Every structure is written in structure tokens, then in C-alpha cells.
Amino acid sequence: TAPKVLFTGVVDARGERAVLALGGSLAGSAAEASHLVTDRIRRTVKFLCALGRGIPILSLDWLHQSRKAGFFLPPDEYVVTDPEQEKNFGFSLQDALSRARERRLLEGYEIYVTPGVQPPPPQMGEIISCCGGTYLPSMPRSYKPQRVVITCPQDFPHCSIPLRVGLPLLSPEFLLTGVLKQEAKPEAFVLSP
């Protein structure tokens, strides 16, 4: 089927024109997208979601060069290469992409997000779903392995139940750093007093 192309962090009017002209469409969300187009690595919801699903994450040259050719080119040579940000976050995009393609990062995870977290619960939720985790929109009331709560200092009134039932309280970085590297380390993101 025709590509459903997502963009993040760029206005790429040239690329948008290429998408419709070549017979693809604009993706309305990471979940419906086949391709993410962008120029750099950024921790946006779309970027993390796209990585989580392990879809192609391509530079602006893919659609540009595709349009010169007259058809959607193969993605392989257009992978986003951002050595500066790969260094900044201490990971390899392509390595992280292979990980996502081999396994779902958050398989077996049930994750609740408190209301003051950034990105907000629904958007944090779409990052969780895209990694094969179960987004918990309702407050969990029992302990289960790999059942975690994402919270923050100002959400202490919301930690009341998790705390009673013995659920781990974790920083957003568990997901924001974890999804980006495609490495899940719940032990390292436990919130201290």
C-alpha cells in the first residue's frame, strides 16, 4: 500500500508535495504512519513513537530524491544520520531501530502516567503503545511485575495509591531516555525522596 508519511520538527513543503505527487498520503499520527521524515534526532512524541514501532526514520533527501526518480525510492540510503545527537544522547539510531524491529521494548509492561508529567498522559500513552506496552488510563490498585507508574514531584497526591500497593514510581526519563536508546532500565529511573 501507498506510504503514509509523518514529519516531525520540520516544515518540508517540498517533501509534502513529493508525498502526494508520488501517490502516498500524509500520516495523521505515528500509529497510522509507515514513514517518519525529519532532519535531526529530536525527543518529540512523533520521533519517540516512530522509533518505538521501528518504522523507517528518514532524512529530507528521501522524498526529494524520490520525486526526481518519479517513484518512491527504497529507504535504505536515507536513514537519518545525526552523529552530534547520537553522541549527545549516547546511542545509535540504527542500533536502536534494529532493537525495535527485533522486539517490542515494553512488551509485558503496564504503565500509568500521573496528570502533571511531560509529555502529558495521553501523549506519553501513545509512546507506550508504540513500544508494545499497555497504557493504563485508570489508576492501578494492585501490584503486578512490570506494572509501573510514571510521575513527578508535584504529583505526590496522585502517588497515594501506587505507594500503598507497592508500585514503583519512575521519572519520565525511563521512557524519554529508554525509548530513544530502545533500552528499558526501570531500576535506574526510580524516584528518590
Partner: peptide
Amino acid sequence: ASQEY
């Protein structure tokens, strides 16, 4: 622009 985190 889209929020970065």
C-alpha cells in the same frame, strides 16, 4: 512547533 522533551 512540536514540543521537544
